[PDB]
Amino acid sequence: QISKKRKFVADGVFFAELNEVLTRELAEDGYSGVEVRVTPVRTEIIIRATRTQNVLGEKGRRIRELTSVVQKRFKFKENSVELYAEKVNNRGLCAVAQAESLRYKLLGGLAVRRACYGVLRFIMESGAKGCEVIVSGKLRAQRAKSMKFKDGYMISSGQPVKEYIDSAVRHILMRQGVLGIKVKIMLDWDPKGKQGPTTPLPDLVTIHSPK
Amino acid sequence: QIHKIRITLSSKNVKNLEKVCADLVRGAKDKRLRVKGPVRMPTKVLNITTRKSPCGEGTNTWDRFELRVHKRVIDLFSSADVVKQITSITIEPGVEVEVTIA
Amino acid sequence: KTYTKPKKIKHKKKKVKLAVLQFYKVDDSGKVQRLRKECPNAECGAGTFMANHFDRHYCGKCGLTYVYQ
Amino acid sequence: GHSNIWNAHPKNYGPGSRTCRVCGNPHAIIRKYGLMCCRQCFRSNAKEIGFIKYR
Amino acid sequence: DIMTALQLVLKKSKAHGGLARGLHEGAKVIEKHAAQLCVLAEDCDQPDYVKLVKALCADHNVSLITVPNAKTLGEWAGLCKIDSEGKARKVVGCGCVVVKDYGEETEGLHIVQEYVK
Amino acid sequence: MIISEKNRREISKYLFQEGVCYAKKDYNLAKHPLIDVPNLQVIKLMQSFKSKEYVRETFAWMHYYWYLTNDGIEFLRTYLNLPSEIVPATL
Ligand SMILES: [Mg+2]
Ligand SMILES: [Mg+2]
Ligand SMILES: [Zn+2]
Ligand SMILES: [Zn+2]
C-alpha cells in the first residue's frame, strides 16, 4: 500500500541487496549475475554462474537452502519465491566471470603477467572486439604500481559505452595487501541481441551494394 | 454484467510499457470491447544529487541521479472474467499490472 | 594511564558447604521438619525457602519480601 | 550492564537512531524515498538500484 | 541386570535431559512431586546427607535406589568428558540423582520398577 | 556466553527444523524475528556453532546467513534426541 516511488526504490534496493548477498555467498562457485522476475503471486530469481553444479549442490540442497534463507530474510511468502541456476552463455564475454577467474588464478600463486595475458587471450578468442585488464596494488615491492594489458578495440566516451562495454571490479586479499583487478570487455554488434547490443555504433554507416 | 475495469500500468522502461499497453488494447479490441486510453500520466522523475567524492577534498562535484517512473491508465467496459482473461497474456519483467473496478 | 583509587573487585558469591542441609531437620522417628518458611508464590512452588533476615523474610526466586515486627 | 542502564538512552530520533542499511555507518544517510543508504554506499549501488545519470 | 537396567534408564533420561543432580536441586525437584525416582550413592561421609535424602524420599513416596560408589553414579549421570580412546575422564562424584521424566519406555525401566517395588 | 537451556533448545530446534537462519546485526533487539530468543543470544550461539564447523556463516548488508552442515546436522540430531529419520526441511 506504499506509493509508486517508494515501491520502485524498494525494488531496486532489494535487487542490489540480493546481488550482493549472492556475490558474497557464491564467490568461489562463480556468480555472473542475478535476474528477478515478478509474476502474479510468484517471483522468479535466476542465478547465473559458470558452475551451476556447485550452486545447486547434490540434489539441489544448496539451492534449496538459498531459497529458504532468501524467503526468510526478505519476508517472502512461503512457496512464493524460487531460485533457478542457469548457464552463462559465452562466459568469456562476461566481465564478472573473467574478473573472478583472474582472482582465482592470482590467489593460486600464478604470475600476474601470465594470468592477465591468458585472460586477455581467452576473452579475445571468445569473440570480444577488445578487452582491457588492469592490476593495481603492491606488486613485487612495497611501492604500489599498476599493470595494464590491452588488445583490440575499445571506446570510453559517450552513450554507446553503457551498452558496448561490459566492466567489473574485484578485490583480491593477498598476504601483503589488497590487489585491485579491473576487467573491461568491449562487445560486438549482434542483430539478434543475445551476444551483443542490438544497435549499431553511432558513427558506423553501411552502404548496400548496388544491383 | 458490464463494468468499467480500470487497469494501471507502471514501469521504468518506456518500450516495454508501451508494448504491453498496445497488446492489452489489441486484445480488448479483438473482443469488440470498448477501450478508453491508454492515458499517460506525467512522468515521475525521482532525483538524487550526491557529491562524487567519498570525502571532502577537491572541487565539489555532484552526480545527478534520476529514476523515471512511467504510469499508464486503461479503462475497459466489460465483465471481470473477460478482463482477467485478457490480462493473462504474457507480461515482460519491469511492468506492474493492477486491475480494479472504478 | 594513572589510577587514583584502588581497583574495585567484582562480587563473588560466598561458598556454603551445605546450605540445603540446614533447611531441614530429621527426627529419630523419621519425620522431617523445615526450619525455614516456604514462599507462598505458586511460581516458586513448594521446596523454595525464604531467607531469615534480621527484620524480614526474603525469597531468592521471586524477590517477595515479608517484614515481621 | 544492568538492563535498566545498558543501552537505556532513548534512540527514537536523531543521527544515532539511523544507520546505513549497507554499511551501518550513521553519517550522510540518504532518507529520500526510503533508501536509507549512506551517500557513499548509494553512489556505489546506484546503477543496481536503478538510478541513471542523464545530466 | 538390575544395575545395567538402572544405568540404561539413567543414560536415556540424561539423553532426554529429564534428570536432576545434587541434593540442593534434588530436594526441590522431589518436593515438586515431579520426581518419579531417586538414586543415592552409598559412599557418603555425611550421615545427615543420607538421613535427609531417605526421609524426604519416604515422606514424598518416591522410589529410592542405592549405588555403592558415588563416582560410578556421577559417571552414569554424565558428569565426565568422554574421550575417543575409551571411558570418560575427569570424573566428579555425584551424591544423589533424581529423575523427572524417563522420556520413553525402555527395557531397563521395567526391571528397575520391579526391583524397587 | 550464558544462555538459558530453553533458549538454546529453541534455537537448535529451529535451526535443525529449517536448516537455515538469518539475523540482523542488532545486538540489542529484544527478540529475533523468527525465534522468541533475543537476537544477541541467537547471533552468539550461531557464532559458537560456526567456530567448531557446525555451520557456514555469510555476512552482507548488515545481516547474517547461516547454513547447517553435515557435522552440524549430526550434532543437532544427537543433542535434540531426534530419530535419525527426521532431517532438516532443506533436504
Ligand atoms: Mg569515440
Ligand atoms: Mg564527446
Ligand atoms: Zn518466591
Ligand atoms: Zn553505507
HEC secondary structure over chain D = CCCCCCCCCCCCCCHHHCCCCCCCCCCCEECHHHCCEEHHHHHHHHHHHCCECCC
CA distances from C29 to E49, E51, E55, E59 (A): 16, 11, 10, 12
F70 touches E: beta carbon within 8 Å: no
Q: Among candidates A82, A88, A83, A86, which has minimal Cα distance to A101?
A: A88
Nearest by CB to residue D22, choosing from F25, F28, F61, is F61
Task: Give dist(CA B69, CA A5) in Å, integer.
Answer: 8
Query: Rounded to 5 degrees, what are φ and ψ at E78?
Result: 85, 10
Which residues are registered as beta bridge partners of A85? A47
Alpha helices in chain B (DSSP H): 14-30, 80-87
> Is the residue at D1 inside a domain?
no
- First-to-last C-alpha distance (Å) of chain C: 52
Taking phi over 0 as left and psi of -120 to 50 as alpha, with beta for the rest, E47 belongs to: alpha
Nearest alpha-carbon partner for E95 in E58, E36, E47: E47
> CA-to-CA distance for E55 and E36, rounded, in angstroms?
16
Instruction: Decide if A75 contacts A38 (C-beta within 8 A).
Output: no
Any domain includes D30? yes
Quick one: cell of A104? Answer: 582465482
C17 touches chain E (CB under 8 A): no
Contact of A59 with F51, CB cutoff 8 Å:
no
> Does B54 sit within 8 Å of D53, measured CB to CB?
no
Q: Which of B48, B52, B63 lies nearest to residue D30, judging by beta carbons?
A: B48
Q: Give me the residue label for grid cell 538492563.
A: D3
- Quote the domain boundaries for residue D50: 6-55
User: Residue A193: left (phi > 0), alpha (psi -120 to 50), or beta?
Assistant: left
Residue D42: CB partners within 8 Å, gap ≥ 6?
A: B48, B50, D30, D35, D49
Nearest-CA distance A153 → chain B (Å): 29
Residue D32 resides in a domain: yes
Backbone angles phi, psi at A152, to 5 degrees: 95, -165
Residue type for E54, please?
Answer: K
Asked if residue E2 lies in contact with residue E115, where contact means CB atoms within 8 angstroms, the answer is yes
Can you state the percent helix, strand and coil of chain A, rounding each to 5? 35, 25, 35
Chain A residues closer than 8 Å to F90 by CB:
61, 64-65, 68
Q: Cβ distance A60 to F81 under 8 Å?
A: no
CA A112/CA A117 separation, integer angstroms: 9
H/E stretch holding A17: helix A4-25
For residue A18, the chain D residue with the least C-alpha distance is D48
Distance from CA of D50 to the nearest CA of B (A): 6
Whether D51 is in a domain gets the answer: yes
Question: CA distances (Å), C3 to each of C7, F14, F73, in order?
Answer: 8, 48, 51
**Does E24 sit within 8 Å of C20, measured CB to CB?**
yes
Distance CA F67, CA A72 (A): 13
Partners of residue E95 in chain C, C-beta under 8 Å: none
Q: Judge: F58–A24 Cβ closer than 8 Å, yes or no.
A: yes
Query: How many CB atoms lie under 10 A from the CB of residue C66?
Result: 13
Backbone angles phi, psi at C56, to 5 degrees: -155, 175
Contact E39, E73 (CB under 8 A): yes
Interval between CA A71 and ligand 4 midpoint (Å): 24
In angstroms, the CA F51 to CA A94 distance is: 36
Resolution (A): 2.4
Closest CA to A178 of A148, A139, A149: A139
Domain annotation covers residue D48:
yes
User: Could you tell me where the beta strands, DSSP code E, fall in chain B?
Assistant: 3-11, 34-40, 44-51, 62-78, 95-101
DSSP tag of C23: G
CA of A131 to the centre of ligand 1 (A): 16
Task: Say if the Cβ atoms of E46 and C48 lie within 8 Å.
Answer: no
At residue E20, φ and ψ (nearest 5 deg) are -115, 155
Q: What does the alpha-carbon distance between residue B71 and residue A139 come to, in Å, rounded to a whole number?
A: 53
Q: How far does residue B59's CA lie from ligand 2's centre (Å)?
A: 22
Which residues in chain B touch residue A35, judged by CB atoms under 8 angstroms apart? 93
| Number of compact structural domains in chain D | 1
A67: cell is 531459497
Pick from A69, A76, A92: nearest CA to A41: A76
For residue B55, the tally of other CB atoms under 10 A from its CB is 7
**In sequence order, which residues have a C-beta less than 8 Å from that of residue A28 and are 6 or more positions away?**
A54, A104
Phi then psi dihedrals of residue F24, to 5 deg: -70, 140
- Pairwise CB contact (< 8 Å): D54 & B64: yes
Q: Which grid coordinates are listed for B33? A: 470491447
- The C-alpha angle A78, A81, A83, rounded to 5 degrees, equals 130
Residue D26 lies in a domain: yes
